[PDB]
Amino acid sequence: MKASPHRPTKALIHLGAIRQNIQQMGAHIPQGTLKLAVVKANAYGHGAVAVAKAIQDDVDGFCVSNIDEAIELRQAGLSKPILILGVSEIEAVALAKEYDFTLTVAGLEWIQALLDKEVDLTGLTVHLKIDSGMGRIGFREASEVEQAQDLLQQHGVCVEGIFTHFATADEESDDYFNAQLERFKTILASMKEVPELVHASNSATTLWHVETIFNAVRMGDAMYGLNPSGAVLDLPYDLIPALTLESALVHVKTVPAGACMGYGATYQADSEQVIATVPIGYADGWTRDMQNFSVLVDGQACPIVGRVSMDQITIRLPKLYPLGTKVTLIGSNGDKEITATQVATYRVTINYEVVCLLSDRIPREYY
Amino acid sequence: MKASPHRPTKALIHLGAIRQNIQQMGAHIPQGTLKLAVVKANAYGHGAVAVAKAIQDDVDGFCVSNIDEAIELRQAGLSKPILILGVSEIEAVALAKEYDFTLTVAGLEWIQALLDKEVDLTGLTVHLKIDSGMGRIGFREASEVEQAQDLLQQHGVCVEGIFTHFATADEESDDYFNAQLERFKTILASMKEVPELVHASNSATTLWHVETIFNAVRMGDAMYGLNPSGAVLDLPYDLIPALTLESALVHVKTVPAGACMGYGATYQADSEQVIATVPIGYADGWTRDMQNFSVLVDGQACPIVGRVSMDQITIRLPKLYPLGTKVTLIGSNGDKEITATQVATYRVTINYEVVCLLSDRIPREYY
């Protein structure tokens, strides 16, 4: 989808909030700890380039999900280290050396495919991924790690770091987290040589298991001011939500009792009422399950009535308003606020998904 | 999100399927009927520019949701008429006039605001929207419409068309559909001068209510080979889905009973089994509610086990397969097929939203 600047629907991104969030996390981790800003998925829908430029001088490096996301940052002028967190294609070892990226290595088969293809590996920097119980990617046994470490170093790869990832750091129970931490430590303890940069901590590990931090933290959701646990756990200190989502009224009508709104005619006015149309819909990532959720107009909750269309929603207003009146979908308006977490809860999902699905059709504006 | 060509996740768009679907619709409507290709929301996530260029010679116009989508078509050299379906901003009308876009006009308040800005509207082409029971945008009263048509003509605006839209053309029951149709016809009958180009028919109306077609059809879902009713109604003739979604294995392991996958550790292997990782996740629009749905690998259904991550899913394979083995998420694979309708039903949504949410991180390739 192409950014639509001539439509009044927009996402506002408070870059200072992101900076402040990084500061508050910094104030609460040990002194030498490296801060890696996770800006995968276009900085969780906030804008990877604009966010990276705003905060570069405050972090030690970036993390992205794939090499194309890293390339995007390099082309824009970002100069700090970038770690690609997932598996890369064989056809991208050469690029890492040319753009100066660090790659994650997670399995023997992958290394053996790279060796078979006979690519030169000499300049390459990598981190080894350990699967300590997330079951997603990484070496699962100590012997596998060392065999991989031996084989990489001998083809001249620099094995710089080693990391794992936690599945349950954002839950009340700490049993699964503890089991993973111990697995990871035992695997590190059995290596004859441990890579110099060891890291395991996502946002939730940083916020609730601060005493378990290794040499770096990978800051995601918290950087954007989002509670990684959603509504489950209280933050140990305040985070400011970076992203706000707004639009305006483009049609306002009074309808008599009996009038139906939307596909399926699933909503029927029981009395005379004011119905307004707002130019956002599911192609913008305001999904169909937002029906009956409220937006804010002039400090008041207005329900989305009838089905969400591809490009438009109809809402019920408490009275007549002019064309162009501001609609707040995420953010504050009057004395009321809607958070991305509140949106995720309504949809039965997590705030990560809400912000990522905000489509590129909505322009991002920065302040 | 930026297209990631160095990752093996891609959407294949068969332009020949789209061509055949338009031809198929043409064969089942009167020979004189104009066909307008609806390519809002980046052609429902299929690629508005590439789809528009592929089919331009076979259609009489394009429909988009806003001026910026219209500009994107023009800047790529499309020359056919472009109708903007939703309300346009007042500040954007001068730009629209320079590009010869056809704008939708839906309310008197809007027209008044436009005239208050003293911008020259001479030669602007518009269509009037009639709300006949969609309750979204458009004139609801016969006299509202003629006041509008009069005000516009007095300022040199050319009123070329008039349209309405149906809320329930894709349902078994025809009651609401018929009331809308009669309301529309009653409106048109009450005007002293009906604009030349009358249209009302979306995909569902075109498919299931052929006898109701006016001068033109607006082809949406059916053009992409998608059943507008999902699984509710049988198609009157064959449609070929245009979009296939595929990826590849990037990690493969065998885990014993007891091993857990994904965030929250919500899936625990109850037997030794093969688990592979595929680089697609909810930031690509493969949403978290896809957990426990299956993808296809080597003609076999393989469930998504554990939570969907932002960039990755883990699936259970029936035996070992090498890295790079193709995964089909939407499309055919061996003797099996997964449709966007099946995906939609699983999520409790409609196929429109499935394809619209496939983010731009997925490159489109055109066949």
Author numbering:
A (entry chain B), B (entry chain A): 1 to 367
Article passage:
The bacterial enzyme alanine racemase (Alr; E.C. 5.1.1.1) uses a covalently-bound pyridoxal 5"-phosphate (PLP) cofactor to catalyze the racemization of L-alanine and D-alanine, the latter being an essential component of the peptidoglycan layer in bacterial cell walls. The lack of alanine racemase function in eukaryotes makes this enzyme an attractive target for antimicrobial drug development. In all of these structures, Alr is a homodimeric enzyme formed by a head-to-tail association of two monomers. The active site in each monomer is located in the centre of the α/β barrel and contains a pyridoxal phosphate (PLP) co-factor covalently connected to a lysine residue by an internal aldimine bond.
Here we report the crystal structure of alanine racemase from S. pneumoniae (AlrSP). Crystals diffracted to a resolution of 2.0 Å and belong to the space group P3121 with the unit cell parameters a = b = 119.97 Å, c = 118.10 Å, α = β = 90° and γ = 120°. AlrSP forms a homodimer in which the two monomers form a head-to-tail association, typical of that seen in other alanine racemases. Each monomer has an eight-stranded α/β barrel domain (residues 1-238) and an extended β-strand domain (residues 239-367). The pyridoxal phosphate (PLP) cofactor is connected to Lys40 through an internal aldimine bond and resides inside the α/β barrel domain. As an incidental finding, the AlrSP structure contained additional electron density within the A monomer, at the end of helix 1 in the N-terminal α/β barrel domain. This planar density resembled a carboxylated aromatic ring, therefore a benzoic acid molecule, which fitted and refined well, was modeled into this region, even though the compound was not added to purification or crystallization conditions (topology and parameters obtained from the Hetero-compound Information Centre-Uppsala, HIC-UP). We observed electron density consistent with a carbamylated lysine at the NZ terminus of Lys129, as seen in most other alanine racemase structures. The smallest constriction in the entryway corridor of AlrSP is between Tyr263' and Tyr352 of the inner layer, which provide an opening width of only about 2.6Å for an active site inhibitor to pass through (the distance between the closest atoms of these two side chains with the van der Waals radius for each atom subtracted). A cluster of hydrogen-bonded water molecules forms an ordered pentagonal ring and some adjacent partial rings in the active site entryways of both monomers of AlrSP.
